[PDB]
Design an enzyme around this catalytic site. Sequence first.
Site, PDB file in Angstrom:
ATOM      1  N   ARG A 173     -11.145 -38.418 -44.453  1.00  0.00           N
ATOM      2  CA  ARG A 173     -12.383 -39.059 -45.833  1.00  0.00           C
ATOM      3  C   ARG A 173     -11.604 -37.346 -47.053  1.00  0.00           C
ATOM      4  O   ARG A 173     -12.132 -37.822 -48.181  1.00  0.00           O
ATOM      5  CB  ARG A 173     -14.092 -38.829 -45.118  1.00  0.00           C
ATOM      6  CG  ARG A 173     -13.822 -39.896 -43.948  1.00  0.00           C
ATOM      7  CD  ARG A 173     -15.188 -39.465 -44.044  1.00  0.00           C
ATOM      8  NE  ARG A 173     -15.726 -40.649 -42.704  1.00  0.00           N
ATOM      9  CZ  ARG A 173     -16.791 -40.699 -42.099  1.00  0.00           C
ATOM     10  NH1 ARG A 173     -17.935 -40.758 -42.647  1.00  0.00           N
ATOM     11  NH2 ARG A 173     -16.874 -41.727 -40.886  1.00  0.00           N
TER      12      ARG A 173
HETATM   13  N1  LIG Z   1     -14.844 -49.886 -50.209  1.00  0.00           N
HETATM   14  C1  LIG Z   1     -14.053 -49.484 -49.158  1.00  0.00           C
HETATM   15  N2  LIG Z   1     -13.088 -49.017 -49.456  1.00  0.00           N
HETATM   16  C2  LIG Z   1     -12.397 -48.447 -48.884  1.00  0.00           C
HETATM   17  N3  LIG Z   1     -11.902 -47.270 -48.370  1.00  0.00           N
HETATM   18  C3  LIG Z   1     -13.491 -47.696 -47.530  1.00  0.00           C
HETATM   19  C4  LIG Z   1     -14.394 -48.042 -47.937  1.00  0.00           C
HETATM   20  N4  LIG Z   1     -15.474 -47.762 -48.097  1.00  0.00           N
HETATM   21  C5  LIG Z   1     -14.867 -46.687 -46.459  1.00  0.00           C
HETATM   22  N5  LIG Z   1     -13.960 -47.474 -46.506  1.00  0.00           N
HETATM   23  C6  LIG Z   1     -13.453 -45.818 -45.512  1.00  0.00           C
HETATM   24  O1  LIG Z   1     -14.233 -45.324 -44.202  1.00  0.00           O
HETATM   25  C7  LIG Z   1     -14.500 -43.999 -44.655  1.00  0.00           C
HETATM   26  C8  LIG Z   1     -15.991 -44.313 -44.575  1.00  0.00           C
HETATM   27  O2  LIG Z   1     -16.820 -44.915 -45.019  1.00  0.00           O
HETATM   28  P1  LIG Z   1     -18.270 -43.386 -46.041  1.00  0.00           P
HETATM   29  O3  LIG Z   1     -17.497 -42.798 -46.021  1.00  0.00           O
HETATM   30  O4  LIG Z   1     -18.616 -45.093 -46.649  1.00  0.00           O
HETATM   31  O5  LIG Z   1     -19.116 -43.846 -44.303  1.00  0.00           O
HETATM   32  P2  LIG Z   1     -20.327 -43.903 -43.476  1.00  0.00           P
HETATM   33  O6  LIG Z   1     -20.967 -45.178 -43.875  1.00  0.00           O
HETATM   34  O7  LIG Z   1     -21.316 -42.675 -45.138  1.00  0.00           O
HETATM   35  O8  LIG Z   1     -20.492 -43.278 -42.732  1.00  0.00           O
HETATM   36  P3  LIG Z   1     -21.430 -41.393 -41.934  1.00  0.00           P
HETATM   37  O9  LIG Z   1     -21.877 -41.756 -43.309  1.00  0.00           O
HETATM   38  O10 LIG Z   1     -22.173 -42.163 -40.515  1.00  0.00           O
HETATM   39  O11 LIG Z   1     -20.224 -41.157 -41.218  1.00  0.00           O
HETATM   40  C9  LIG Z   1     -13.869 -43.391 -45.996  1.00  0.00           C
HETATM   41  O12 LIG Z   1     -13.571 -42.524 -45.691  1.00  0.00           O
HETATM   42  C10 LIG Z   1     -12.850 -44.653 -45.822  1.00  0.00           C
HETATM   43  O13 LIG Z   1     -11.528 -44.259 -45.376  1.00  0.00           O
END
Ligand SMILES: Nc1ncnc2c1ncn2[C@@H]1O[C@H](COP(=O)(O)OP(=O)(O)OP(=O)(O)O)[C@@H](O)[C@H]1O
Lengths: 489, 363, 166, 523, 46
Positions: free
Chosen positions: D356
Site C-alpha cells: 500500500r
Molecule cells: N478504488 C480502488 N482502486 C484500486 N485499488 C484499490 C481501490 N480501493 C482499494 N484498493 C486496493 O486495496 C488496498 C486496500 O485499500 P484501503 O486502504 O482502502 O483498505 P481499507 O478498506 O481501509 O481496509 P483496512 O483499513 O482495514 O486495511 C489498496 O492499497 C489498494 O491496493
Amino acid sequence: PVADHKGRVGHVSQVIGAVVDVHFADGVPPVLTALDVVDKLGRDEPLTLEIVQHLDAHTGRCIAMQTTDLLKLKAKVVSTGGNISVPVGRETLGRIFNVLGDAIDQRGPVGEKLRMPIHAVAPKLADQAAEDAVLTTGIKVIDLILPYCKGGKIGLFGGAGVGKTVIIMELINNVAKGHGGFSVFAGVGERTREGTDLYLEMMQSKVIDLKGESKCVLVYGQMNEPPGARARVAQSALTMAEYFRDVEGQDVLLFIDNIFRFTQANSEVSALLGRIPAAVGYQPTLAEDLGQLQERITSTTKGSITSVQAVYVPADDITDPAPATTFSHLDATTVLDRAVAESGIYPAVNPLECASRIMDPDVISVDHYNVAQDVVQMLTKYRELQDIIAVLGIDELSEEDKLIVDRARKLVKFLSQPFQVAEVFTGMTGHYVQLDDTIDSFSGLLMGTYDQVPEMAFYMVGGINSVLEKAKKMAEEAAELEKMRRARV
Amino acid sequence: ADHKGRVGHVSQVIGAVVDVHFADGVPPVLTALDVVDKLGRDEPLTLEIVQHLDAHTGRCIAMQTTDLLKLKAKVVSTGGNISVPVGRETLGRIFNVLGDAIDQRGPVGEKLRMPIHAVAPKLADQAAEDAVLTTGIKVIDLILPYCKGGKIGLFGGAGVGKTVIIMELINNVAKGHGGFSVFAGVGERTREGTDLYLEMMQSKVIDLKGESKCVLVYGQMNEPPGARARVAQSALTMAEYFRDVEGQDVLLFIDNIFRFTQANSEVSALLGRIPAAVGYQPTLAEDLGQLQERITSTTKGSITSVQAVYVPADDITDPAPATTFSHLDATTVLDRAVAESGIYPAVNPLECASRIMDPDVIS
Amino acid sequence: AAKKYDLFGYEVDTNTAPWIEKIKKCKYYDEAGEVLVNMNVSNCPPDIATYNATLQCIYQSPSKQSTPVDNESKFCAMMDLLEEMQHRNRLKPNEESWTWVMKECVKSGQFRLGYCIQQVMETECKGCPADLVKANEANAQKAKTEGKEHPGHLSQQAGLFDVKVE
Amino acid sequence: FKTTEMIGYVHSIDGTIATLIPAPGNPGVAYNTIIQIQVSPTTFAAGLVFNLEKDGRIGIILMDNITEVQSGQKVMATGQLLHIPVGAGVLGKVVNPLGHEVPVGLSTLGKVDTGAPNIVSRSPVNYNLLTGFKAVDTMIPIGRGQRELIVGDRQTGKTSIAVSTIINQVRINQQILSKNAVISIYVSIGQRCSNVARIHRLLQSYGALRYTTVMAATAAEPAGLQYLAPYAGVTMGEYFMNRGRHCLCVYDDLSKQAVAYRQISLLLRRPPGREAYPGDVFYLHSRLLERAAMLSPGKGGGSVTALPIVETLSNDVTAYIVTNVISITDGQIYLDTKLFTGGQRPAVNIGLSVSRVGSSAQNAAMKGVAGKLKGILAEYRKLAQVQTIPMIRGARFVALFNQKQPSYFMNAIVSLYACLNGYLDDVKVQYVKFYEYLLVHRDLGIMYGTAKNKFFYMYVQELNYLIRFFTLNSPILHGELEEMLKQHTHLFLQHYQSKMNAIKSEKDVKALKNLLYSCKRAV
Amino acid sequence: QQRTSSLYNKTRQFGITAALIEILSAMSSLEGNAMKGVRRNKFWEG
Ligand SMILES: Nc1ncnc2c1ncn2[C@@H]1O[C@H](COP(=O)(O)OP(=O)(O)OP(=O)(O)O)[C@@H](O)[C@H]1O
Ligand SMILES: Nc1ncnc2c1ncn2[C@@H]1O[C@H](COP(=O)(O)OP(=O)(O)OP(=O)(O)O)[C@@H](O)[C@H]1O
Ligand SMILES: [Mg+2]
Ligand SMILES: [Mg+2]
C-alpha cells in the site's frame, strides 16, 4: 459560574487495566467528570481519568485516557470541576488535536476563545431539518444506485483492505477541497501513517494554509492509543463539528474513520467495568452508545453536517452486532464485498446490498430513478441466473437469458471506475464522471444500443465516451492482429 | 526434597478433584501425594498437585477413583513428582502412569527412577545437523524419509496393517541403529492393548525368555483423565533415559496423540478453566508444546516419535489436529484401497509428505 | 543562511560548518557515517559540501574500520552516498564528487569502472580531467599486458555437461 | 533487577498466573511493573503486575521459572517497568523476552512500554528494503519503515522468506557505510526449539549474526514470555530507530502470540470474544505494529521495517486474527499453498499480494523495469494454443521467479530486463534457469573471445550501485547492456540449447535433468 | 462440494464455540450474583 466539586481530592482505590476506581472523602463528583492524577509517579506524561460509574456515595469508577503504567494505590487525584472540554472556533482550523484537545502539531498555542464539553445532548425533534438534496461525488456507482444526500449520514461497510479508506480519500478530494464550508477529519483507531499522509495532502493542496486561513480540523486517536482515548476522540471531533454547525450556521463535512473502533473501545472498557457481555462479546449498551453518538451527527435548522463514516466488518461477518446496529443510523449505506474486489472490480460496492434514502422520484430526477431501478432489476436477475450458470453452464440458458447475462456482465464491468487517488494501484489516470453523463450512459446501455461494443470496453473507464474510445482502440488492435495473421498466409 | 514425607489432610472432594491441606505448606506443584488411608479401597490412591489455592491448601487431580474417600484423610507427600523406573530392566514389560508392572511377571528390579516432568532440551543441546533415520522400508526411506528427533504423523485407522508397520519399525530400528522403542497407549481400548501385546510376544519383539526391544506403557480408557494425561509423559521419560544415558536413537509410539489432547482438555475442564474455541483447554498449545519439544535429537542421542493422528469429524482445520500438525516433521498415510490391491505396506506415496525432502539434508 | 524547512514546514538547522570540521578529523570513513547520523538526528541535514567532505574522507581513509571487513569497497560506499544525496535528498552531485569517485576508481585499480565514471562525468560535467583518464588507461594497459583483463575462470571453455553449477 | 522491598507473599498459582497477598502495612506495588519472587535463597522468578485489587491482592503474570513458584514465597518489588539491554553489544546473540542471553551450542537499556511516534513524527517511506526475490522486489515493493504482512498456510516458506530477507542484507551491509546498514531482530514466538537452532545455524553460515539478533520464545516456554516476546523485540529495534538507523524486526509469528494472550485472558476468566479471543486482541497487535514507523527528518530519519507472519487454515483469509493483522499492516505477501506444492516457490501469490505504501520507496531502476512487468503479468493471468508476445514473456517471468536463495540486485534486475525485452523468446521455458545461471555466473562472451563491451560485465559486481543510480535505460549503461545481452543470447542459442535439443540417450537425459535441477536451485 | 464442506466445518466450529461461551457467560452471571456472607466461626481461636 464555578463547579461546586472543583479541586475535590480523591485517592486511587483500585487499578485494573485502563479502569481505575477513585475514592472521594467528600463525595464522588458527577459522572463524566474529568480528574487529574497529581502524584508524579515517575510517569513521562500526565494522567487523566473520566468518571463513568458510581460504585457508592464516595467511590467512582473511571477510565484513563493515557496508559496507567506506574500507577499505585492511594495516588492523589484532583477533580477538574467539569467534563472533558475541547477548543472550538476558527482558532482550531488547520490544527491537529487529540482526545483531550491538546494541539499535537508542535505549532504555536491554539489560543481558542472558549471550550466546550465533549458530552452534549443531541438535537431535539423541533430542531430537525427537512431538506433533501443530492451530493455529486463523481463516482458512477454511488451517484447512480445509492446517491448521497447533502447534510445526510453516510456509511461505508467493508472488511479488511477492501477499499474503505480509498473511497474516503476519493470523496475528500472530490468534495472537501471544492467545499464552501468547513471540514473535520476524525481518525478513530486507524493507522497513524494515514494521518500523516492526509495532513501532507491537505497542506500541499492548500486546504490547510498554516500561513493563511485553513478550513479543516484534524482530531486523531489512533490504534496505538489506549481504549480510553479511542472512545472519546469521536466525541471531541463531533463537538467541534457541532460548534461549527450551530454557533456559526456553517455547512460541515465530518469524515470519521473508523467508527467501528469506537464500539470496539467501548466493549474493551466495558469488559473491565465488570459487565455481563452481550452476544459475541460486546457490551450490553452497544445500541445505546451508537444511538447517543449518531443522534448528535445530524443536520438541524441552524446548520448542516454531511457525515461520511467508515464501518469495519470483522471477519467479513456483516451480521456482527457492531456493523449490524449501524445500518439503522445511516441515510446512505455502501456495502463493499471482498469477492468483488478479488475480481478486479474497484470500487467493490455490492449494489444489491446498498440502499439510499433519496432514491425517490420526489427528490432525484425521474429519469435517474428509472435508470437506477432498471439497473438494480438487471443485476438481481443476473445474480439469480448465476446460480444456474455456475453449475450447468452458460449454454444451458434461454435465448433471452443469454442477452440478459451479457448486458448484466457489461453493467458489472461498467460500474468499475479508476479513482484519481488509486492511480498507483490502477496505473491509470482517474476519472470524474458527471451525474448526467452516468445517467445517460446507463440508460443507453440498458436500451441495448451498445450490444456490439466489446464487454471489456466497459472495464475501468469513465463515461460512455471513454467506453467508445477504449472500444475503438481495441478494434484497432484486433484489426492489426487480423492483418498480421492474414499476411502470414 | 525438603518436603519428603510431609503430612497433609484432605479438605475437599469433588469428583476427580481433591484439595489437600498441609499445615507446613503445600509441596511444589506437580508433586505426587499418597493417600495413606486404604480403609476400603481395592487400589492405592495417588494425587497430583496441579494448583495452589493458598499458602496451605492445594488442589490435586486423582489418578484413580476417589471412592470411599473421607475428608481429613491423611495424605503423605512422596518427595517430588511422579517417579517412573528407567533402565534396561523395563524392556518387555507393561507399565502404567505410576510405573508399576501390570503384567504380573515379577518385580521390575529397577536401579533408578526419574520424574515424569522434565524440562525440554535447551537450545544448546540441539543436534548440529539434520540426519535421516533409515527405517529399512523402501517406501519410507525413499519418498518420505524420517529424520532423527522428528515427529511422524501416522494416518489411517485399523484394517491397513498399522500394527504390523509399528512392529516392523521397532524391529528395524534395533536391528540397524541398535536403539530401543517405547509404546504409549493413550486412551486406548484395553482389548486392542491385549492384542498388541500378544502380537509383540508372537513376533519375538518382546521375548519373555530372551531380550526384548520394546517397553509398553498403557493408560486405558477406563482410567480417569488424570492418568491419560500423564501416561505419554511417563513413556517419554523412559525414552529420554535411553536417549541421554545410553545415547541411542530411540523410538516413541503414541496411540493416539488426539487422546492425549482429549485427556488434557477433560482435566482442564474439571479444574473449572474456561475452554477456548471449539471447547479445548486454553492451554492446548502449551500442553502439546511441553510434550513435543521433549522429542528431539540432542547431541547425545535422539528420539524419533511415530504418533498416530486422529482427525475429529474429518475436519482437518480442527484446533486439535491443526495444532498437532505444527509439530509434525513427516506424514505417513495408510489407505484401505492400497491394501485391497495387494500392496503392503499400504502407503499412499503421493499422499505422504516430509520436510527433509531437500538436497540440503538428504543426498 | 536562508531559512530552510522540512516536509512539515518546521524550520531546519543550516549551520553545517562544525560537522564538516568533525568529518575532517576522521581516521576511518565508517566514522564519517556516524557524523552524518548525528547531523540527521540533530535536525541538521547534510548539504552538498558535507557530502563532498564525506567522499574525501572515504577516499583518504585507510579502511572502513580498524579491523578489516569481509567486502570493504570504497566505490560502493561512495556510490551509495551519491544515490542517497541524489534520490532521497534532491541534491545534484557537482563535479567535485564525481572527481573524487574517479580518483578512487583509478587509485584502487578498477579500470573498468573508470570508463563508466568518465562517461558519467562527461555526460553530467563539462569533462573529465586528462590526468585521471591517463591513469585509468595506464591501469587498463598494465592489466592487458599481464593478461589480467578478465578473471581466468571466465575464459575457460565449458560445454553443456562440463559446467560446474556447484 | 534491583529489588527495593517486600510487597507481599504468593497466595495462589493457577498455571501461568498468580495472585499475591499484601505484606504488613500494604507497601503497594506500581501497576505494570516487574516483581521478583524469591523462589530460592539466591534465585528469583520474574513476574508482571497486571491487577491491583481493592483488598490489596496483586495479580501477577509469571514469566520464567514457573515450576519453582510456590505459595507463601516472598515477593520483592523493583519499582520500575521492564527494561532490557539494547545496543551493539546484543547483536549476534540469542536472548529471551526478559533480556537474558540463551547459551548456544558451539550498557543501554530500553523500555518495553514506549509509545509509537505521533502524527508529525513520521514521514513517507522513501528508502527501499530489498528482499532478494524478484517477485517481491518487483510486484510488491517494500520500503523501510513499512509493516508488511506474510500470510499463508503451514509449511509454505513464511519463515524461509523472512530469513532470506535478513540474509540478503549481509552483502549490502558489508559494502555501504554502517549508517545505511539494515540490522535485523528475528523474534521467534511459540516456534520449535529445533527450528530456532536451524535458523541460527543458517544465519551464522552466511555471517548474518554481525547484523542480527535472535529473540526466542519456544513452545515449551510459558505464555507470558510468548506474549511479551514481540514487544521486547521491537524495543530492541527501536534503539536504532531513535538514532538515525534502520531495523528489520521480524515476528514469527503473531498468531501464536494471540493464542498465548487468549490463554492468559481465559485463565483470568475474562469475557471471551469472537473465536474465544479477548476483546482487546486487536489492541494487542495494534500497540505492537504501530511502534514500527519511519521517523521524520527532524527526529533523525530512522526506521523499523516490520514483517509480521500469520498462518491461515485452508487458505482462509477471513479469520478474526488474520483480518485484524491485515487491518493494521501496510500490505501482505500471500503464499498460496497450491503454488507451493506445485513446485512454484516461494509461491508468492502476486494476485492477492499488495504493497500500500511501498510503491514510492521502490528504486528508480526497479520501478522502471517493474512498470511493464505488471501489465505483462496482468495480461498473462487473463489469458490463462495461440502464444502471443505477452504469453511468452509471462511464462518466462514466472519461470524466473523460481528462487531458493536471495539474489543480488544487479543479477535480478539484469535478468528481468533481459526477459522483458524479449531476449528469452527463443529460449525454452525449461532452460530459463540454465540461461540465467550462464548469464550471471559464467560469461559466454569472454569464453568464446567475442566480447566488445568496455566495462559492463556481470562479473563486475561493482556495477550494481551504478545501475541503481540512474537506471538500466540510461544512455550510459544501455548500449553495453544491449550488446552483452545480445551476445549472450546468440551464444547460448548457438551452443547450449542446440545441443540440449539433440539429446535422446537415456543417460544424457538423466544428466540434463540433473543439470536443470542443479541450476534451478542455484540461480 | 469443497466450498460447502468448508463452510459446514466453519459453521459447526463457530456454533460449538458460541454455545459454550453463552453457557459460560450464564454461569459467570450466576456466580457473580452470589455474595459471601459473614463467617460464623471462632476467629479469636487461632
Ligand atoms: N478504488 C480502488 N482502486 C484500486 N485499488 C484499490 C481501490 N480501493 C482499494 N484498493 C486496493 O486495496 C488496498 C486496500 O485499500 P484501503 O486502504 O482502502 O483498505 P481499507 O478498506 O481501509 O481496509 P483496512 O483499513 O482495514 O486495511 C489498496 O492499497 C489498494 O491496493
Ligand atoms: N524458495 C524456496 N525454495 C525451495 N524450498 C523452499 C523455499 N522456501 C521454503 N522452502 C522449503 O520449504 C519447507 C518449508 O519452509 P518454511 O520452514 O520456511 O515454512 P513455514 O511457513 O515457516 O512453515 P512452518 O509452519 O513449519 O514454520 C522447508 O523445507 C524449506 O526449506
Ligand atoms: Mg483503512
Ligand atoms: Mg516457520
